[PDB]
Design an enzyme around this catalytic site. Structure first.
Site, PDB file in Angstrom:
ATOM      1  N   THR A 149       7.267  28.478  31.188  1.00 35.18           N
ATOM      2  CA  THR A 149       8.600  29.084  31.024  1.00 35.18           C
ATOM      3  C   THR A 149       8.503  30.615  31.132  1.00 35.18           C
ATOM      4  O   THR A 149       9.455  31.258  31.615  1.00 35.18           O
ATOM      5  CB  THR A 149       9.196  28.795  29.654  1.00 35.18           C
ATOM      6  N   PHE A 209      16.049  30.166  23.673  1.00 30.84           N
ATOM      7  CA  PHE A 209      14.880  29.735  22.894  1.00 30.84           C
ATOM      8  C   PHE A 209      15.167  28.582  21.954  1.00 30.84           C
ATOM      9  O   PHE A 209      14.425  28.363  20.997  1.00 30.84           O
ATOM     10  CB  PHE A 209      14.282  30.940  22.157  1.00 30.84           C
ATOM     11  N   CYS A 220      12.037  27.956  19.606  1.00 30.99           N
ATOM     12  CA  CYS A 220      10.783  28.309  20.274  1.00 30.99           C
ATOM     13  C   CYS A 220       9.904  29.098  19.288  1.00 30.99           C
ATOM     14  O   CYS A 220      10.316  30.172  18.848  1.00 30.99           O
ATOM     15  CB  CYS A 220      11.075  29.152  21.529  1.00 30.99           C
TER      16      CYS A 220
HETATM   17  C1  HEM Z   1       4.226  32.326  24.598  1.00 27.68           C
HETATM   18  C2  HEM Z   1       5.036  31.547  25.291  1.00 27.68           C
HETATM   19  C3  HEM Z   1       5.639  30.336  24.573  1.00 27.68           C
HETATM   20  C4  HEM Z   1       5.050  29.500  23.685  1.00 27.68           C
HETATM   21  C5  HEM Z   1       3.586  29.596  23.141  1.00 27.68           C
HETATM   22  C6  HEM Z   1       6.043  28.507  23.343  1.00 27.68           C
HETATM   23  C7  HEM Z   1       5.861  27.446  22.508  1.00 27.68           C
HETATM   24  C8  HEM Z   1       6.819  26.540  22.053  1.00 27.68           C
HETATM   25  C9  HEM Z   1       6.613  25.482  21.063  1.00 27.68           C
HETATM   26  C10 HEM Z   1       5.240  25.053  20.407  1.00 27.68           C
HETATM   27  C11 HEM Z   1       7.818  24.905  20.835  1.00 27.68           C
HETATM   28  C12 HEM Z   1       8.202  23.737  19.922  1.00 27.68           C
HETATM   29  C13 HEM Z   1       8.473  24.462  18.570  1.00 27.68           C
HETATM   30  C14 HEM Z   1       8.783  23.502  17.431  1.00 27.68           C
HETATM   31  O1  HEM Z   1       9.691  22.665  17.625  1.00 27.68           O
HETATM   32  O2  HEM Z   1       8.158  23.614  16.314  1.00 27.68           O
HETATM   33  C15 HEM Z   1       8.780  25.552  21.712  1.00 27.68           C
HETATM   34  C16 HEM Z   1      10.119  25.319  21.763  1.00 27.68           C
HETATM   35  C17 HEM Z   1      10.990  25.851  22.694  1.00 27.68           C
HETATM   36  N1  HEM Z   1      10.743  26.868  23.609  1.00 27.68           N
HETATM   37 FE1  HEM Z   1       8.988  27.887  23.787  1.00 27.68          FE
HETATM   38  N2  HEM Z   1       7.201  28.817  24.046  1.00 27.68           N
HETATM   39  C18 HEM Z   1       6.953  29.919  24.804  1.00 27.68           C
HETATM   40  C19 HEM Z   1       7.834  30.544  25.634  1.00 27.68           C
HETATM   41  C20 HEM Z   1       9.098  30.083  25.892  1.00 27.68           C
HETATM   42  C21 HEM Z   1      10.028  30.676  26.869  1.00 27.68           C
HETATM   43  C22 HEM Z   1       9.714  31.890  27.808  1.00 27.68           C
HETATM   44  C23 HEM Z   1      11.162  29.975  26.765  1.00 27.68           C
HETATM   45  C24 HEM Z   1      12.480  30.040  27.510  1.00 27.68           C
HETATM   46  C25 HEM Z   1      12.760  31.023  28.353  1.00 27.68           C
HETATM   47  C26 HEM Z   1      11.014  28.959  25.784  1.00 27.68           C
HETATM   48  C27 HEM Z   1      12.005  28.052  25.423  1.00 27.68           C
HETATM   49  C28 HEM Z   1      11.837  27.123  24.426  1.00 27.68           C
HETATM   50  C29 HEM Z   1      12.902  26.243  24.021  1.00 27.68           C
HETATM   51  C30 HEM Z   1      14.294  26.184  24.674  1.00 27.68           C
HETATM   52  C31 HEM Z   1      12.340  25.395  22.908  1.00 27.68           C
HETATM   53  C32 HEM Z   1      13.141  24.301  22.140  1.00 27.68           C
HETATM   54  C33 HEM Z   1      12.954  23.026  22.956  1.00 27.68           C
HETATM   55  C34 HEM Z   1      13.708  21.849  22.321  1.00 27.68           C
HETATM   56  O3  HEM Z   1      14.602  22.065  21.446  1.00 27.68           O
HETATM   57  O4  HEM Z   1      13.389  20.662  22.724  1.00 27.68           O
HETATM   58  N3  HEM Z   1       9.730  29.031  25.245  1.00 27.68           N
HETATM   59  N4  HEM Z   1       8.129  26.545  22.425  1.00 27.68           N
END
Ligand code: HEM
EC number: 1.14.14.1
Length: 412
Positions: free
Chosen positions: A225, A350, A357
């Site tokens: 992402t 996010f 996120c």
């Molecule tokens: C360092 C980069 C990133 C890491 C390590 C990361 C990691 C994660 C993790 C482990 C979760 C699940 C969290 C939980 O439910 O406890 C999550 C959720 C999420 N992340 Fe990230 N993320 C990163 C970057 C991004 C970016 C750049 C975006 C969007 C532009 C993004 C969008 C999302 C979204 C929309 C969710 C919620 C998904 C859902 O509700 O099913 N993430 N992320």
């Protein structure tokens, strides 16, 4: 009665998703049918939500909790009950969330900064070393950067993507290796907390099986992402020269030292606005799924039963004209000049609430550092007049996006 798109006999709406661009198809359907429509497949039903007025209700954690969509249930075959693919009620979700959250804040981000700079410098060196008239394959190089950064900052492991033509190659030996390499090694990184942190609530650390799932989870969610975000934002920059001028000016005024410090990255306010406006138009994890915790009525009109699924279509939320004004397709970072002015639950790249996120600050710090350095060191040209073509996987990316970068010859 709820709007619903065209049907295919006993297959109901399923064939609508037999396309390599399903989220784009769903956006077109939302433009046709409005803030909510039903989507039926044999054996399943979901409702796609597009307006801030409904999505703000969906984001009420007393009424709805995170659901694992189809895609996520398949991802769970290899990411297991890691944070991204666990249900909120599984013991390993809150345990891991508590253990890992301190890894993703701020004292943490200062500690990652130097290894982020390690990989960003490799990117800038790559481009400085290109010959006259060569070009950059943007999503490809962004993915080399983002994968390497999560690998190094999180696990002290070098994917060495910039030493390669073809993306990095399995999963078990890699995970095995990251672990073995660490046992044999002294870091204070993401993998440290995975291996030694205890959840203050249960008093327990993660077990071996869940540690493996978290490493898989972070390696994937930790880079794809973010690659997409950097790629879209460079696309919008080259399509909007006045925005590029403002961002490049800030980078020159702010990044006064041969490499950026943590403080200087934080001072890149306008670069931060550009990144959010890219996240508005093309949020790179564009949908998330929820289920109704109990029977409840959405928007005073749509009764739901306990367990009913809803999908938030984030790009359509981010185009709600009642919130953003009529000009929603235009790229205007000045929308984000003051984050306070954005109505609650109107901007959700996010995700939402306690299932938001975990990596958001990491992603934004990486992206701002890197774009700042790119804008300091090069002028960019859209030499092909590239036509946006969005490839969909779990995430979104501008496929085939290429530019030329001419060096400002500023020592690194
Ligand atoms: C360092 C980069 C990133 C890491 C390590 C990361 C990691 C994660 C993790 C482990 C979760 C699940 C969290 C939980 O439910 O406890 C999550 C959720 C999420 N992340 Fe990230 N993320 C990163 C970057 C991004 C970016 C750049 C975006 C969007 C532009 C993004 C969008 C999302 C979204 C929309 C969710 C919620 C998904 C859902 O509700 O099913 N993430 N992320």
């Amino acid at each position: 009665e709820m709007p619903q798109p065209k049907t295919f006999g006993e297959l109901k709406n399923l064939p609508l998703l037999n396309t390599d661009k399903p989220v784009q198809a769903l956006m077109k359907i939302a433009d046709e049918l409005g803030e909510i429509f039903k989507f039926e497949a044999p054996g399943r039903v979901t409702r796609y939500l597009s307006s801030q007025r409904l999505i703000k209700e969906a984001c009420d954690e007393s009424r709805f909790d995170k659901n694992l969509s189809q895609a996520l249930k398949f991802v769970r075959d290899f990411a297991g009950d890691g944070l991204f693919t666990s249900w909120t009620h599984e013991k390993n979700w809150k345990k891991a969330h508590n253990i890992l959250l301190p890894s993703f804040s701020q004292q943490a981000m200062k500690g990652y900064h130097a290894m982020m700079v390690d990989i960003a410098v490799q990117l800038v060196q790559k481009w400085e070393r290109l010959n006259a008239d060569e070009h950059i394959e943007v999503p490809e190089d962004m993915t080399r950067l983002t994968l390497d950064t999560i690998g190094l900052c999180g696990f002290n492991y070098r994917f060495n993507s910039f030493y390669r033509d073809q993306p990095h190659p399995v999963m078990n030996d890699l995970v095995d290796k990251i672990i073995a390499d660490r046992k044999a090694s002294q870091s204070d990184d993401l993998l440290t907390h995975m291996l030694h942190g205890k959840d203050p609530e249960t008093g327990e650390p993660l077990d071996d099986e869940n540690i493996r799932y978290q490493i898989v989870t972070f390696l994937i969610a930790g880079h794809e992402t973010t690659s997409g975000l950097l790629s879209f934002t460079l696309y919008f920059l080259v399509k909007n020269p006045h925005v590029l001028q403002k961002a490049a000016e800030e980078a020159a005024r702010v990044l006064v030292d041969p490499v950026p410090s943590y403080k200087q990255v934080k001072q890149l306010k306008y670069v931060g606005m550009v990144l959010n406006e890219a996240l508005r138009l093309w949020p790179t994890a564009p949908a998330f799924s929820l289920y109704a915790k109990e029977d409840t009525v959405l928007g005073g009109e749509y009764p739901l039963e306990k367990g009913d699924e809803i999908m938030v279509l984030i790009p359509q939320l981010h185009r709600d004209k009642t919130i953003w004004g009529d000009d929603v397709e235009e790229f205007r970072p000045e929308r984000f000049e003051n984050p306070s002015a954005i109505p609650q639950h109107a901007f959700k790249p996010f995700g939402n609430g306690q299932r938001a996120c975990i990596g958001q600050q990491f992603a934004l710090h990486e992206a701002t550092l890197v774009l700042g350095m790119m804008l300091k060191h090069f002028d960019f040209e859209d030499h092909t007049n590239y036509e946006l073509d969005i490839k969909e996987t779990l995430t979104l990316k501008p496929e085939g996006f290429v530019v030329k970068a001419k060096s400002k010859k500023i020592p690194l």
